[PDB]
From a paper:
FCoV-23 is a recently emerged, highly pathogenic recombinant coronavirus responsible for a widespread outbreak of feline infectious peritonitis. All coronaviruses are decorated with several copies of a homotrimeric spike (S) glycoprotein that is the target of neutralizing antibodies, drives viral entry through receptor binding and membrane fusion and contributes to pathogenesis. FCoV-23 S-long comprises an amino-terminal S1 subunit, folding as five domains designated 0 and A–D, and a C-terminal S2 subunit. Collectively, these findings identify APN as a bona fide entry receptor for FCoV-23, which seems to have broad receptor species tropism, mirroring that of CCoV-HuPn-2018.
To reveal the 3D organization of the infection machinery of FCoV-23, we determined cryogenic electron microscopy (cryo-EM) structures of a prefusion-stabilized S glycoprotein ectodomain trimer construct comprising D0, which we designated ‘S-long’. 3D classification of the cryo-EM data revealed the presence of two distinct S protein conformations: one with a population of trimers with three D0 regions swung out, and the other with a population of trimers with two D0 regions swung out and one D0 region in a proximal conformation. These structures were resolved at 2.3 Å and 2.7 Å, respectively. In both conformations, domain B (the receptor-binding domain (RBD)) adopts a closed state. a,b, Ribbon diagrams of the cryo-EM structures of prefusion FCoV-23 S-long in two distinct conformations defined by the positioning of D0: the ‘swung out’ conformation (a) and the ‘mixed’ structure (b). The overall FCoV-23 S1 subunit architecture is reminiscent of that of the CCoV-HuPn-2018 S1 subunit, with which it can be superimposed with a root mean square deviation (r.m.s.d.) of 0.89 Å over 496 aligned Cα pairs (excluding D0). The FCoV-23 S2 subunit adopts a spring-loaded prefusion conformation and also closely resembles that of CCoV-HuPn-2018, with which it can be superimposed with a r.m.s.d. of 1.3 Å over 453 aligned Cα pairs. The similarity further extended to the conservation of key APN-interacting residues, including FCoV-23 S Y549/Q551 and W592 (corresponding to CCoV-HuPn-2018 residues Y543/Q545 and W586, respectively), and to the conformational masking and glycan shielding of the receptor-binding loops by the N567 oligosaccharide (topological equivalent to the CCoV-HuPn-2018 N561 glycan) from a neighbouring RBD in the closed S protein trimer.
Numbering used by the authors:
A (entry chain C): 429 to 527
B (entry chain C): 282 to 330
C (entry chain A): 282 to 392, 399 to 527
D (entry chain B): 478 to 527
E (entry chain A): 626 to 676, 684 to 787, 801 to 870
F (entry chain B): 724 to 772
G (entry chain C): 626 to 674
H (entry chain C): 871 to 975, 983 to 1086, 1098 to 1214
The structure:
Amino acid sequence: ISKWGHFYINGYNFFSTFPIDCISFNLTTSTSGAFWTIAYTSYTEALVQVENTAIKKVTYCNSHINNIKCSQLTANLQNGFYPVASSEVGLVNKSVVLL
Amino acid sequence: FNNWFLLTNDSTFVSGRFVTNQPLLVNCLWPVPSFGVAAQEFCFEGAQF
Amino acid sequence: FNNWFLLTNDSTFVSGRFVTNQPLLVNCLWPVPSFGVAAQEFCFEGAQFSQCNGVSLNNTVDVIRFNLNFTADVQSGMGATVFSLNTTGGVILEISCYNDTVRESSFYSYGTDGPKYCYVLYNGTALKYLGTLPPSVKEIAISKWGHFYINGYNFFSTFPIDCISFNLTTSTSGAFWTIAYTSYTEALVQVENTAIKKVTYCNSHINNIKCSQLTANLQNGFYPVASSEVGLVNKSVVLL
Amino acid sequence: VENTAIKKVTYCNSHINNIKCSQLTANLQNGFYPVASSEVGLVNKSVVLL
Amino acid sequence: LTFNKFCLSLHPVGANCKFDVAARTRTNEQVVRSLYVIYEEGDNIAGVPSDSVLHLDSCTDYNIYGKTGIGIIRQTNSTLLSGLYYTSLSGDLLGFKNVTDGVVYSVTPCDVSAQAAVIDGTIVGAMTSINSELLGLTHWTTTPNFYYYSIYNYTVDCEPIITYSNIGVCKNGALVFINVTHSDGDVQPISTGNVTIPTNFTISVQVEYIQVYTTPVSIDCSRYV
Amino acid sequence: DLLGFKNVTDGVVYSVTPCDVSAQAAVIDGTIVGAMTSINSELLGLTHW
Amino acid sequence: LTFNKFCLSLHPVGANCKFDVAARTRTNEQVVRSLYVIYEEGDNIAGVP
Amino acid sequence: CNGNPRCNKLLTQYVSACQTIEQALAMGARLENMEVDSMLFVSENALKLASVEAFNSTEHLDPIYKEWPNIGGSWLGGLKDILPSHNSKRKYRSAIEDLLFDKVVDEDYKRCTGGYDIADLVCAQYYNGIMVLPGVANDDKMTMYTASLAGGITLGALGGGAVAIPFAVAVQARLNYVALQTDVLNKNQQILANAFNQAIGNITQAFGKLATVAKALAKVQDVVNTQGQALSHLTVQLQNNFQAISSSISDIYNRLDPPSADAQVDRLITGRLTALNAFVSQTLTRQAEVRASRQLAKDKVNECVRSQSQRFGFCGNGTHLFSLAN
Amino acid sequence: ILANAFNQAIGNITQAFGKLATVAKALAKVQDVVNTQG
Amino acid sequence: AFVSQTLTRQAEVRASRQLAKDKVNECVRSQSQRFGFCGNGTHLFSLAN
Ligand SMILES: *[C@@H]1O[C@H](CO)[C@@H](O[C@@H]2O[C@H](CO)[C@@H](O[C@@H]3O[C@H](CO[C@H]4O[C@H](CO)[C@@H](O)[C@H](O)[C@@H]4O)[C@@H](O)[C@H](O[C@H]4O[C@H](CO)[C@@H](O)[C@H](O)[C@@H]4O)[C@@H]3O)[C@H](O)[C@H]2NC(C)=O)[C@H](O)[C@H]1NC(C)=O
Ligand SMILES: *[C@@H]1O[C@H](CO)[C@@H](O[C@@H]2O[C@H](CO)[C@@H](O[C@@H]3O[C@H](CO[C@H]4O[C@H](CO)[C@@H](O)[C@H](O)[C@@H]4O)[C@@H](O)[C@H](O[C@H]4O[C@H](CO)[C@@H](O)[C@H](O)[C@@H]4O)[C@@H]3O)[C@H](O)[C@H]2NC(C)=O)[C@H](O)[C@H]1NC(C)=O
Ligand SMILES: *[C@@H]1O[C@H](CO)[C@@H](O[C@@H]2O[C@H](CO)[C@@H](O[C@@H]3O[C@H](CO[C@H]4O[C@H](CO)[C@@H](O)[C@H](O)[C@@H]4O)[C@@H](O)[C@H](O[C@H]4O[C@H](CO)[C@@H](O)[C@H](O)[C@@H]4O)[C@@H]3O)[C@H](O)[C@H]2NC(C)=O)[C@H](O)[C@H]1NC(C)=O
Ligand SMILES: *[C@@H]1O[C@H](CO)[C@@H](O[C@@H]2O[C@H](CO)[C@@H](O[C@@H]3O[C@H](CO)[C@@H](O)[C@H](O)[C@@H]3O)[C@H](O)[C@H]2NC(C)=O)[C@H](O)[C@H]1NC(C)=O
Ligand SMILES: *[C@@H]1O[C@H](CO)[C@@H](O[C@@H]2O[C@H](CO)[C@@H](O[C@@H]3O[C@H](CO)[C@@H](O)[C@H](O)[C@@H]3O)[C@H](O)[C@H]2NC(C)=O)[C@H](O)[C@H]1NC(C)=O
Ligand SMILES: *[C@@H]1O[C@H](CO)[C@@H](O[C@@H]2O[C@H](CO)[C@@H](O[C@@H]3O[C@H](CO)[C@@H](O)[C@H](O)[C@@H]3O)[C@H](O)[C@H]2NC(C)=O)[C@H](O)[C@H]1NC(C)=O
Ligand SMILES: *[C@@H]1O[C@H](CO)[C@@H](O[C@@H]2O[C@H](CO)[C@@H](O[C@@H]3O[C@H](CO)[C@@H](O)[C@H](O)[C@@H]3O)[C@H](O)[C@H]2NC(C)=O)[C@H](O)[C@H]1NC(C)=O
Ligand SMILES: *[C@@H]1O[C@H](CO)[C@@H](O[C@@H]2O[C@H](CO)[C@@H](O)[C@H](O)[C@H]2NC(C)=O)[C@H](O)[C@H]1NC(C)=O
Ligand SMILES: *[C@@H]1O[C@H](CO)[C@@H](O[C@@H]2O[C@H](CO)[C@@H](O)[C@H](O)[C@H]2NC(C)=O)[C@H](O)[C@H]1NC(C)=O
Ligand SMILES: *[C@@H]1O[C@H](CO)[C@@H](O[C@@H]2O[C@H](CO)[C@@H](O)[C@H](O)[C@H]2NC(C)=O)[C@H](O)[C@H]1NC(C)=O
Ligand SMILES: *[C@@H]1O[C@H](CO)[C@@H](O[C@@H]2O[C@H](CO)[C@@H](O)[C@H](O)[C@H]2NC(C)=O)[C@H](O)[C@H]1NC(C)=O
Ligand SMILES: *[C@@H]1O[C@H](CO)[C@@H](O[C@@H]2O[C@H](CO)[C@@H](O)[C@H](O)[C@H]2NC(C)=O)[C@H](O)[C@H]1NC(C)=O
Ligand SMILES: *[C@@H]1O[C@H](CO)[C@@H](O[C@@H]2O[C@H](CO)[C@@H](O)[C@H](O)[C@H]2NC(C)=O)[C@H](O)[C@H]1NC(C)=O
Ligand SMILES: CCCCCC/C=C\CCCCCCCC(=O)O
Ligand SMILES: CCCCCC/C=C\CCCCCCCC(=O)O
Ligand SMILES: CCCCCC/C=C\CCCCCCCC(=O)O
Ligand SMILES: *[C@@H]1O[C@H](CO)[C@@H](O)[C@H](O)[C@H]1NC(C)=O
Ligand SMILES: *[C@@H]1O[C@H](CO)[C@@H](O)[C@H](O)[C@H]1NC(C)=O
Ligand SMILES: *[C@@H]1O[C@H](CO)[C@@H](O)[C@H](O)[C@H]1NC(C)=O
Ligand SMILES: *[C@@H]1O[C@H](CO)[C@@H](O)[C@H](O)[C@H]1NC(C)=O
Ligand SMILES: *[C@@H]1O[C@H](CO)[C@@H](O)[C@H](O)[C@H]1NC(C)=O
């Protein structure tokens, strides 16, 4: 469930509602005695390998080597030279010149 | 990734490698044990539980 | 294909082979013999007549083609009118040629040897001027949608024609000519000097391959084809 | 132009100068070049209609 | 057709597009008015011919989850735990899932490409992936990669007129397998023991074509443009 | 491009040709010494032919 | 942004382009009016924050 | 056109381009097939001698070679990785060939129309009108060709059965061709055989997991990748809208009246024809390059494997002795 | 014998050219070259 | 595009011309010692048309 109102069941968005400020639940497994999980997650960029509509491997582009891996679409980089950027530009001053 | 899927608004990929923006930065993980009850009014303002 | 031409709305090909949809499915062929008169009020509803040479189809007729030399020996038994047209809404149009020029929205004053000026008449008055009769007319094709082709070129069009009347003869020339009731079909046509030389109908699998390859003499080899055609099929709808 | 300064100007005022301007060089190498046989100026007008 | 929002109006304000209202006479059609449309993409609202049918094992016109086409739909034993429908690299629908029970269905084209063999201006055989009659051919045989239909009486030793790789087709329509060329072998530079030396020679002539030059073209760029 | 047409009155055929055509000029030592052309007319300041 | 001429109008006559005036609610945005712009390229007039 | 009859009727005015595209592809394939067919050949006796088991036995040796235990002899340790063996998945396959075809790398189209599962990439391409002609027969012919070339070296005679000679005798003949040997008593082929065995073992180790080996691996991987990418691009070109509402002809015909639908479909037709023309041009260029490479390979086979060339530095860097092919 | 074989081979080649895998390959190659040029 | 295609063809024909020159020099004007170069078999002489 996304805070923008979208519901995904097994990965597919079947229905959407108005944006949700806050949501309530109260679930249990009764007497089955089964443990399960709840995940509070955020969006991030990653390389995902899928086999038969199932996730097999996830590589996060969180480091320079991981950035190269994501750029090359492979988790096993062969030895060699790869083009990269020397740095990123962030907060910068503004200069205006007019006649 | 047994109960984890790639979210999509359209047809789903069967096989291959893709660079995508997915909800995968796990802010928190709550394991509900056997014979346990998970009840919460969670508002989207943080998950430091 | 001596008095047969490829119909066109534009410039005409001089030489080469082209796959085109042309009025070439001959529903009926009427040979007018020497010293004979061909008179008919043909309405476009079939051409199963007793004078058809061979076997006549039951399909509807698309185009009617007159194959004859339109020389000075050609005479009409309806006077100056060569073709009487009945269009939608009961509007009568006549194609009439005279020996003298007729003013617009006027009628012939004197009512054989010389230039002939042809006009379209609606209520006995000249509506459109078509021009003089050229000395080399070999075929006149008329479609039920109102288009007229002279030697393959569409010179004028009228309202859609429900049914058309004529009454022609070759006088004392003693020349036989032809009338063809034909329908549109796809075929490969070879043209040399704006003249039809060979026609291949795509009516069989081998003919389909020939039309696809733009040649009537296929070399031995393998060619890609479709395994079948899809016709009438059920419809399936799935929704959430 | 060299360093935003004019160094050489060649006017396309002759046939050889026209070829030089077409080839973007003032020193043509020996060879064959495509050209036009003439220019069309004031001409009559002809209209043909049905 | 499916939409999330659909509205008709007589005013142009906020309209994504407009229709053309026209009057048709016996010989002419004249536009008189305009009808404006405000629409949003989605699937909440669907237009129907009048106020869920699935045909299986037969060619049909399908409209499944907004994807339309012609094909044959078959139930499968496959299990795919993620998604609703699946598409190919070119965007064609390959399969979908029934939401009620999770059963997977596959979609295949009704007609496929085939290879027709033409010898002496007639069709003698056809290679196809579907075991069905085509091109007026009735008899057929099975090969490890395809079905082969032929005018040859199938329930052969002949010269292949048309060959590709190991496959050859005879004028009677029969299918033959072509093997690699055989030769006696090469004479070895051995001078020990029993050896063979070629003695009786005839003459063979072999033809080889080689291209030497092209046909150059000069282009007047100004005259072409 | 239009190549020819016919006069409807008498059936006479007329042909249309371009007024100017492409030519090949020979340049030796920065001057024009000759020209190859399909029209027998003077061009590029050349008289003898 | 620099222009040689910039005019806003409520009439479509002579306008190069138009803006879309809309009302934004808590869940929807609806276009109500149009504001037409007549502009010319240049640098005589410049918009500033 | 994805099987749409109206799209086919529209394309009937463009049949010439499809005719040009199809003829260019069928003639290129035919020419390549006729030069490959002319290139390859086998010999029956050489194939009967070309195996590890035959080289490890003495059933084919002439009675005069009683001293030698088998055909391979001291060289067999290097020849077991090159000669075909019975412990292979396919016939006439060697260890190096299997290693190459596994490290670097179905043709049945009857399974695509079965509908027993979701179609894979090859079947999906076939649904789009793209067929890959069979190539397994070419690989089998090539492996038989190389096996026959290897086995012909030890064939003592051509007019009868499979009579064999020891490999050391052939090596000695090659040495005499290089230079007339004058020390018959002090033959030292053991050093050469040991060096050959060690080199072959190191090459096999490199292929399983030496600049020439790396260059060859890079070249074959590049060839495979280039072959795949062109078809991938051609398939992916079918998703382009070409300034139309949709890339699906069926959707266009289901959403629009025929007069507007035809105008929408014409743009897709033109774009797809342009893509096919580009693919054909690239294919023809590749085919010409591979024709030149095939001429080079034929020269190498004729002058380094079937004979001992007198050209300096043609069969490798050094004084050439013999060459084998896989 | 060599002269007779040469004469027969040349005659067969001429017959093939007027209306033998090498001859077919050469004809296909030259036709392909002409068509590609056009 | 036409120029690019023409240049590629010209390079291919240059390679073919080199092959033809080698064939003329080694099979027609002399008797080559290269095995299997002037056809399949023991070469005797070659003619050209
Ligand atoms: C299926 O389709 C639906 C519908 O299109 C998609 O839903 C969209 O989901 C995305 C996130 O994946 C939503 O994007 C977010 O929009 C929020 C609203 O943005 C407004 O406000 C910001 C400033 O606050 C403006 O810049 C912007 O123009 C809008 O006016 C934003 O608040 C979010 O931004 C913040 O969060 C992201 C992280 O999520 C940060 O990167 C940003 O910097 C910022 O902090 C965010 O961008 C989008 O609104 C949804 N659309 C709708 C219509 O609801 C589904 O994603 C799609 N599903 C799949 C699987 O593809
Ligand atoms: C020179 O230019 C003129 C003017 O454009 C062309 O004249 C057209 O000729 C074609 C035939 O060649 C005419 O096409 C026909 O239209 C008829 C009217 O169609 C309407 O009704 C049908 C349903 O009944 C609707 O589907 C359609 O949208 C229209 O509303 C149709 O009745 C005809 O269809 C039937 O006949 C054909 C065989 O002819 C069958 O294939 C069909 O299945 C069907 O049974 C037919 O399609 C067209 O109307 C003419 N246009 C005009 C404006 O009059 C000339 O053809 C052209 N000349 C040359 C040489 O190119
Ligand atoms: C390069 O050029 C060489 C020659 O310089 C070619 O090699 C020749 O290839 C041919 C074709 O394969 C060989 O001829 C074949 O011999 C087989 C065995 O021959 C028997 O009969 C003769 C009778 O005189 C005996 O001398 C001989 O010992 C054998 O007992 C035949 O079986 C072959 O017959 C074919 O035709 C009949 C008729 O239909 C069929 O039934 C057979 O199955 C078969 O198809 C054929 O006669 C010839 O021996 C080879 N000569 C040499 C010197 O090696 C190469 O092929 C060529 N290379 C390339 C790549 O083209
Ligand atoms: C939720 O459903 C999933 C299936 O989607 C259940 O997972 C399955 O659990 C069974 C029983 O433990 C597993 O069976 C085992 O199979 C292996 C073969 O790989 C075998 O070696 C074991 O001995 C055993 O038979 C099954 O594999 C497993 N499937 C997957 C994909 O993990 C899961 O148990 C269900 N959870 C609950 C709480 O019911
Ligand atoms: C209608 O006009 C056509 C011409 O467009 C007439 O056809 C022509 O008829 C003449 C006289 O029969 C033919 O002349 C013959 O020419 C051949 C040479 O090929 C010669 O061998 C014969 O001895 C004779 O001189 C002429 O070829 C022929 N032209 C064509 C194209 O067929 C036709 O006769 C006219 N019909 C009527 C009824 O007037
Ligand atoms: C790759 O090549 C290297 C040499 O470049 C091979 O290593 C060499 O192996 C031989 C034996 O095969 C060693 O020679 C000696 O052999 C006798 C055999 O009786 C033994 O008694 C001696 O103790 C000694 O091992 C030689 O020293 C050795 N050379 C080096 C530099 O290590 C290697 O085996 C080859 N690899 C493969 C996988 O074939
Ligand atoms: C194509 O080649 C074939 C052979 O592969 C040629 O047929 C052969 O023709 C010769 C004569 O040229 C026949 O030999 C004999 O010639 C003497 C001449 O005096 C004659 O008295 C004998 O009765 C006999 O004809 C030979 O048998 C024959 N071979 C075959 C298999 O038919 C053929 O002529 C060549 N074609 C051309 C157009 O050159
Ligand atoms: C075609 O025209 C001829 C010639 O005008 C018509 O023949 C006339 O027929 C009427 C009776 O209908 C007779 O009184 C006339 O004497 C005939 N004239 C001649 C010259 O013979 C003929 O009837 C017309 N055909 C049709 C079907 O109307
Ligand atoms: C032109 O065709 C129209 C077609 O309608 C003819 O009008 C019909 O004439 C018949 C004669 O039996 C009447 O029964 C119908 O009621 C008429 N229909 C209409 C709609 O008026 C008309 O007569 C034809 N014109 C000529 C001169 O023959
Ligand atoms: C999906 O599967 C369900 C069953 O799991 C199908 O529902 C059946 O539909 C038929 C035809 O209307 C009914 O006779 C049955 O009673 C239904 N079975 C149920 C509800 O359990 C449904 O048709 C399938 N959907 C498809 C094929 O699109
Ligand atoms: C080479 O072949 C010859 C025959 O051409 C062989 O000589 C024959 O050998 C057999 C088997 O021992 C004897 O029965 C014959 O009497 C021999 N014939 C003659 C004329 O001597 C010879 O043995 C073969 N040589 C080799 C090395 O195999
Ligand atoms: C087509 O040819 C006719 C003659 O067949 C030309 O008509 C002539 O025009 C000139 C100039 O006006 C008159 O002096 C003649 O008397 C006309 N001759 C006739 C009517 O027989 C006509 O000009 C030609 N059309 C062109 C050249 O476009
Ligand atoms: C093509 O020729 C090869 C080589 O002669 C044939 O291979 C033979 O196959 C049979 C059957 O398995 C074996 O018993 C022989 O030993 C093989 N011969 C050799 C020399 O290895 C092959 O069968 C032929 N293929 C066809 C389809 O006829
Ligand atoms: C700022 C760049 C200066 C020049 C850097 C030169 C060296 C590094 C890049 C080498 C590229 C090698 C290309 C071949 C592929 C490979 O072997 O990796
Ligand atoms: C469903 C198809 C299965 C595979 C069919 C293979 C055989 C038939 C086609 C051969 C193509 C030959 C291409 C070269 C040109 C030619 O010689 O005709
Ligand atoms: C009207 C043109 C008739 C033909 C003219 C032929 C001769 C002149 C042009 C020669 C072109 C040479 C091209 C190669 C480049 C060069 O050497 O200049
Ligand atoms: C902008 O400039 C100021 C000084 O004018 C400097 O202190 C500051 O770091 C600059 N900000 C940047 C470069 O982001
Ligand atoms: C449609 O399905 C029915 C049964 O529901 C069948 O009888 C009919 O033949 C089908 N029509 C086709 C396949 O055109
Ligand atoms: C136009 O034609 C007239 C004669 O009608 C002629 O004198 C004049 O030179 C022509 N003008 C041109 C060719 O520019
Ligand atoms: C699919 O299921 C059927 C029984 O419904 C069975 O006969 C068939 O073999 C199965 N196929 C596979 C591949 O499991
Ligand atoms: C084909 O062969 C079978 C063999 O049983 C025979 O019965 C049949 O008549 C043959 N058919 C033809 C058309 O010859």
